[PDB]
Design a protein around this ligand. Sequence first.
Ligand SMILES: CCCCCCCCCCCCCCCCCC(=O)OC[C@H](COP(=O)(O)OC[C@H](O)CO)OC(=O)CCCCCCCCCCCCCCC
Ligand code: SF4
Ligand code: SF4
Lengths: 197, 61
Amino acid sequence: STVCPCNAMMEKGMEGEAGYLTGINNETLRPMIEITKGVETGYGSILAISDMESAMRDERIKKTKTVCTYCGVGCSFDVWTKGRDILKVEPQEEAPANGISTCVKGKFGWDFVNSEERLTKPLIREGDHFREAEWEEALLLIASKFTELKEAFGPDSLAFITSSKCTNEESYLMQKLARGVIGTNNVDNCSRYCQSP
Amino acid sequence: AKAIKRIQKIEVTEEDQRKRDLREIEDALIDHKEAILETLHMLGHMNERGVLPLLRGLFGQ
Ligand SMILES: CCCCCCCCCCCCCCCCCC(=O)OC[C@H](COP(=O)(O)OC[C@H](O)CO)OC(=O)CCCCCCCCCCCCCCC
Ligand code: SF4
Ligand code: SF4
């Protein structure tokens, strides 16, 4: 899909969603294509119109670089989106770790971002359920509980784990909260299971 | 009653005049409720059809 020059081998995410005139139904898009084939005499003018349609796409299509979260190859690619849905994962030749190389995960596995199962609000364990609580009240609850177990049994009885799936800033903030805030050294990640030996 | 000519106009501050004119605009909206609904549907159907996004690409780039 990445190496195809034309739209011959292209992701279904782009199909019917990239531009404005391409979401038209095929039963009513193909006759328009035949009309334009039989109408325009020189490719220059309709090519300019297609360049305008490319500029059209440029506004709605957001192309931002990112690095795949799944595995440690750290392949970097642009993620062509239209609002919130992910249309394409386009690698670039300038990508250091992969260039154009990509796997199924990093190039077609990003539907989890827009998944409805995603936790949009903080959840607090109320009785035997998870109540959708406000951000501020959840923050106050966690802070108060951590202060309680920090000033009762000491910070040494506090242990926090950062995700190896999160950015460097995230793990640095975990370890700073443990040491520069809580005062404990009990921190780890999946690397204890993965890269510690 | 004696002879008095001067008129003490009521002190309508900026807040009161703004509220009165906003109420007038709201009443005008009320008179054209169906028209406003039709125009909102206009925008909705244009945006769904991509006409409004097409113009958004036209005027953004
Ligand atoms: C007296 C009447 C005067 C009218 C006077 C009318 C005056 C107003 C202008 C109307 C035409 C605007 C431009 C429409 C074309 C450009 C935009 C476009 O290409 O947008 C694609 C979209 C595909 O739709 P899809 O849903 O498939 O795709 C949705 C998403 O793109 C993907 O999700 O086009 C449409 O929706 C069609 C819109 C209406 C076109 C009407 C053409 C004839 C108008 C004149 C005759 C009217 C006679 C009425 C009376 C008989
Ligand atoms: S953008 Fe034009 S030239 Fe490229 S694949 Fe699509 S139709 Fe063909
Ligand atoms: S694109 Fe594939 S190989 Fe590259 S980092 Fe993501 S999951 Fe790993």
